[PDB]
Ligand binder design. Structure first.
Ligand SMILES: *[C@@H]1O[C@H](CO[C@@H]2O[C@@H](C)[C@@H](O)[C@@H](O)[C@@H]2O)[C@@H](O[C@@H]2O[C@H](CO)[C@@H](O)[C@H](O)[C@H]2NC(C)=O)[C@H](O)[C@H]1NC(C)=O
Ligand SMILES: *[C@@H]1O[C@H](CO[C@@H]2O[C@@H](C)[C@@H](O)[C@@H](O)[C@@H]2O)[C@@H](O[C@@H]2O[C@H](CO)[C@@H](O)[C@H](O)[C@H]2NC(C)=O)[C@H](O)[C@H]1NC(C)=O
Ligand SMILES: NC(=O)c1cc[n+](COC[n+]2ccc(/C=N/O)cc2/C=N/O)cc1
Ligand SMILES: NC(=O)c1cc[n+](COC[n+]2ccc(/C=N/O)cc2/C=N\O)cc1
Ligand SMILES: CC(=O)N[C@@H]1[C@@H](O)[C@H](O)[C@@H](CO)O[C@H]1O
Ligand SMILES: CC(=O)N[C@@H]1[C@@H](O)[C@H](O)[C@@H](CO)O[C@H]1O
Ligand SMILES: *[C@@H]1O[C@H](CO)[C@@H](O)[C@H](O)[C@H]1NC(C)=O
Ligand SMILES: *[C@@H]1O[C@H](CO)[C@@H](O)[C@H](O)[C@H]1NC(C)=O
Ligand SMILES: C[C@@H]1O[C@@H](O)[C@@H](O)[C@H](O)[C@@H]1O
Lengths: 533, 528
């Protein structure tokens, strides 16, 4: 007849899941649980409203649709890019979440891990194979939750002040899912008093904004920010620039036939989703990399102030945070606009291409600011060495967009009462499809965190599987106790003075100092002073 | 002794025979080359010395031009060696000639020394400028002149004829013209004149390179720890007028004519006593009365003239010591002294940056702090003491010299660069100062050869090797012995040699990272 372990009642009604096969053992999975009414038609650009109760049993037996988003076409059929592309049908009916739990269901409350995918706030899906939660759940016996949230214009087009397009609705999607976790995760055996948020890139930036937003802060207890921070120059936008991009997007699709917000939004709602996707990138002020059209907006509501101001003025006592980056944060983004770069050659650029790439990698700054960047990243004993220039531009984009925003956040949190653990992921996967000059690119620690190497269908080495099991143990130890160390080389906390972090690779843990302290002093201390003058 | 009797165009001279460990040399000290710039001739360009009857006694050094005397460490050898060793006087325009004994009968290459001292001090009579060892060992003619310093040499009311400015530079040029007309009477070759100078003397050498009326009076140049494009070497017309105007107010004097007239009534010591209170702020390596850019001696700023110049056919020898700035820190940087380790704090370091980099915006100062802070050890006292010494040294000497060398080389000049890294065993300064500013001169003049001093046997050999380098360059434009070789400095390779007891070691980059900051970025920041 029926299996009781796959039947759960939540506030909205009854659910039916599936028993998932993993190499280590069975897993209960509830995939495609609706947590909000479909944000379609008149509900486009609007905040999510809760899913109204249902009669009967909802089959939560497979991943639901991917929120409508752009699909990468630079390298068609290439494994390195297709792994991030939608693996389900695109639709605006996309607000569903997923719950993995041990089989049989835990009888005592179990710590919960909530995943927020990244993708520059314009892409991503909880259904990607690299976000498969069955291995983490089986190996460490946690409850893992992941949700879909609206991306691109559908999630972050903002006409600030208007009620028809208030902005930040993609973040409200995440917040609603976190509220769903608080009310319902105990029915799956999860502990709502021990909820750990973790995400990568825009997901990590999202995690940080929930830390800084009081209505979200009460919904979790710990945070993990991988290769992303809310104080990044790409993660937020001002109210005026948000309105300019929304108005230009509407102008590019025939709305109005700016002016009035109500008529302008209503005209945008009549446009097919693909039409908005096709023009969303034409609203960027200049050609750039690591810049996204529609991102969270600082409008005094979700973010009372800029993330940097909230970070500096925040009291973080009672909070544990795990932060980190990969070894080569910037390499991936260079083949998407930096002159002379491609994955199919070694991208040994000239001095002129380096100087031109600086303006692409650091867009919308004065020529004096660009000169400061050139001065700091040029080796004046080898000013035109093609190799050194290629690595330097990669460091420019990586430090400016990831490493130094993360370091600044970690330093301010530790100084203001939070316990911080920092890492640098340095293992290049044996199966990595990207060229070797890219090193360890953005986002390629995720598959090890989720235990993907234990998939028998894939071809990781036996040592990479032990590495994956060790990383899953770190993450789950942090979720359980706020400490990645086991109750063995120790992982010391990160503090603003010593600035200690660990290397994550096949070798045992190695303690180092300084997350590129010299470079990050330029980005976090001096260059803001230069932009003010 | 006919070897000590010489007739120049002005009249007859009587010299003196000196002794060296390698034999005797002929010396002619206190030769007048200008009319005494006293009374109504104060602040005025030098007049050629009128011919005289009888025999001028040229057997001892003449008076030192009126200048400030350091009193921070009274009786301390490290400072007394630079203080005047003859009486002070405005009657001070005399030069000295050293020749081999007996006098050369064939044209001999000529070395012309221009002393340093921030354009406010210095004298050709100092013991460390004794030319007898160079002349004996390398058989050259050596000339050194006294030139007016301080307000007497560089007070300027631009546009006026009573204080035109740069008259101390014109003193040097007049001595160079004197060499062209009279050095052959001593056996010297006026067609082979090499200028060499240290600190403000090196800056003066550079300015003679950039001034056409002086450019034809010599053929080669040596710039030691100084450059004409230094932030201290020149001053604008507006600031020169302000500094001169405040000096008159400080000494009780009121129109340029009425103002210079009142300054000319003041005793020389009075102007000396107030010369440093006209500086705009508390600082180090900043001097009140320096050459002014007024379109005459310098038709443009030295850095502009450097960039626009064709320097083909020119050979220069440039260099620095290992620790250019450490010396200046004990004259105003908070927390520094020669009598303790000077392990300063972060707060003193930040305060010392404003003293070491005076008269720049807060943003420019923050850029300095960023580049010279180790953000892994931001408060380490030993690293901060080292860093502030590099700030003063790079900004004032190393990077101005690196800029001049790179531009000259890339524009036709053959450049040889060095770093002097030997600390003298007799050095009285504390060990944390390393090799301070000016402490390569005694080795180039071969002072270690003096048996009355306590240099080592290897230091004597080292001094002989340095005199050979300098004299080779004076003779051929190439310091190399016709080892390993001393390669030329180029804008790309940036090759220089280290000078110490070890054989020559070739290295790349004169603090290339720090000098890109000072020479490339900071000018853009201050103008934006
Ligand atoms: C390295 O690759 C870049 C990118 O070029 C693309 O990828 C290459 C692998 C090859 O397939 C090219 O044909 C592709 O266009 C090269 O830069 C491009 O050069 C071409 C020709 O000069 C020019 O038309 C493009 O605009 C350039 N693109 C960019 C982004 O600069 C680069 O020259 C290659 N380096 C080599 C071959 O040494
Ligand atoms: C190293 O010395 C400096 C200054 O030299 C001292 O000056 C006299 C006080 C003398 O008696 C000797 O100590 C030294 O020659 C010290 O900095 C001074 O500190 C005093 C207080 O002790 C203060 O009043 C002065 O302003 C400071 N001077 C300057 C130029 O800033 C410094 O403390 C000494 N370093 C130590 C003791 O570690
Ligand atoms: N809506 C659009 O037309 C659009 C959206 C986003 N991009 C940027 O996409 C290129 N890009 C640039 C950089 C990355 C880096 N990822 O780590 C990934 C990708 C591709 N993602 O699908 C271009 C156009
Ligand atoms: N006339 C004055 O009062 C006067 C003149 C010159 N100084 C210079 O004295 C300080 N000083 C003394 C000696 C040196 C020696 N440097 O090698 C350098 C410096 C430089 N900057 O402060 C001070 C006062
Ligand atoms: C200032 C103004 O004109 N506001 C109105 C707004 O109230 C209304 O919702 C919209 C659509 O009719 O038209 C506009
Ligand atoms: C909100 C909307 O779509 N329309 C409203 C409607 O009540 C009316 O046309 C007017 C009166 O205030 O304000 C606007
Ligand atoms: C692993 O490699 C083998 C080699 O033939 C192949 O059969 C298999 O499909 C590969 N797996 C993946 C996930 O690429
Ligand atoms: C060293 O030389 C000095 C003169 O420079 C002399 O006074 C002294 O007697 C010598 N010996 C010692 C031990 O200092
Ligand atoms: C239909 C909407 O409401 C009414 C008017 O204010 C406008 O025509 C607007 O288009």
């Amino acid at each position: 007849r029926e299996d009781a372990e796959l039947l759960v009642t939540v506030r909205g009604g009854r659910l039916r899941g599936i028993r998932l096969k993993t190499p280590g053992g069975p897993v209960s999975a509830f995939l495609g649980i609706p947590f909000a009414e479909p944000p379609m038609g008149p509900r486009r650009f609007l905040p999510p409203e809760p899913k109204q109760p249902w009669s009967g049993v909802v089959d939560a037996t497979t991943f639901q649709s991917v929120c409508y988003q752009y699909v990468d076409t630079l390298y068609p059929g290439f494994e390195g890019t297709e792994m991030w592309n939608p693996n389900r049908e695109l639709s605006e009916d996309c607000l569903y979440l997923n719950v993995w739990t041990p089989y049989p269901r835990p009888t005592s409350p179990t710590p919960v891990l909530v995943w927020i995918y990244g993708g520059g706030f314009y892409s991503g899906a909880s259904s990607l194979d690299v976000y498969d939660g069955r291995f983490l759940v089986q190996a460490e016996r946690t409850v893992l939750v992941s949700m879909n949230y609206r991306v691109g214009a559908f999630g972050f087009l903002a006409l600030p002040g208007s009620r028809e397009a208030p902005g930040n609705v993609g973040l409200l999607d995440q917040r609603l899912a976190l509220q769903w976790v608080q009310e319902n995760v105990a029915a799956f055996g999860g502990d709502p008093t021990s909820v750990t948020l973790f995400g990568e890139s825009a997901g990590a930036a999202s995690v940080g904004m929930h830390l800084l937003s009081p209505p979200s802060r009460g919904l979790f207890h710990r945070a993990v920010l991988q290769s992303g921070a809310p104080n990044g120059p790409w993660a937020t936008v001002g109210m005026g620039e948000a309105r300019r991009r929304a108005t230009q997007l509407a102008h590019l699709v025939g709305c109005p036939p700016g002016g009035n917000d109500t008529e302008l939004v209503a005209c945008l709602r009549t446009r097919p989703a693909q039409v908005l996707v096709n023009h969303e990138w034409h609203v960027l002020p200049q050609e750039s990399v690591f810049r996204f059209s529609f991102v969270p907006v600082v409008d005094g509501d979700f973010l009372s102030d800029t993330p940097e101001a909230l970070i500096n003025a925040g009291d973080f006592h009672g909070l544990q945070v795990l932060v980190g980056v990969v070894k080569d944060e910037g390499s991936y983004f260079l083949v998407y606009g930096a002159p002379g770069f491609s994955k199919d050659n070694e991208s040994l650029i000239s001095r002129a291409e380096f100087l031109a790439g600086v303006r692409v990698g650091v867009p919308q700054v004065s020529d004096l600011a660009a000169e400061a960047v050139v001065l700091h990243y040029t080796d004046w004993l080898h000013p035109e060495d093609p190799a050194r220039l290629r690595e330097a531009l990669s460091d420019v984009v990586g430090d400016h967009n990831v490493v130094c925003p993360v370091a600044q956040l970690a330093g301010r949190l530790a100084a203001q009462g939070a316990r911080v653990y920092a890492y640098v992921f340095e293992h290049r996967a044996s199966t990595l499809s990207w060229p070797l000059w890219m090193g360890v690119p953005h986002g390629y620690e995720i598959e090890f965190i989720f235990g993907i190497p234990l998939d028998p269908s894939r071809n990781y080495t036996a040592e990479e599987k032990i590495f994956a099991q060790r990383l899953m143990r770190y993450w789950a130890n942090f979720a359980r106790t706020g400490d990645p160390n086991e109750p063995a080389p120790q992982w010391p906390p990160y503090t603003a003075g010593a600035q200690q972090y660990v290397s994550l690779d096949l070798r045992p843990l190695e303690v180092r100092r300084g997350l590129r302290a010299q470079a990050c002093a330029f980005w976090n201390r001096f260059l803001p002073k230069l932009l003010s003058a």
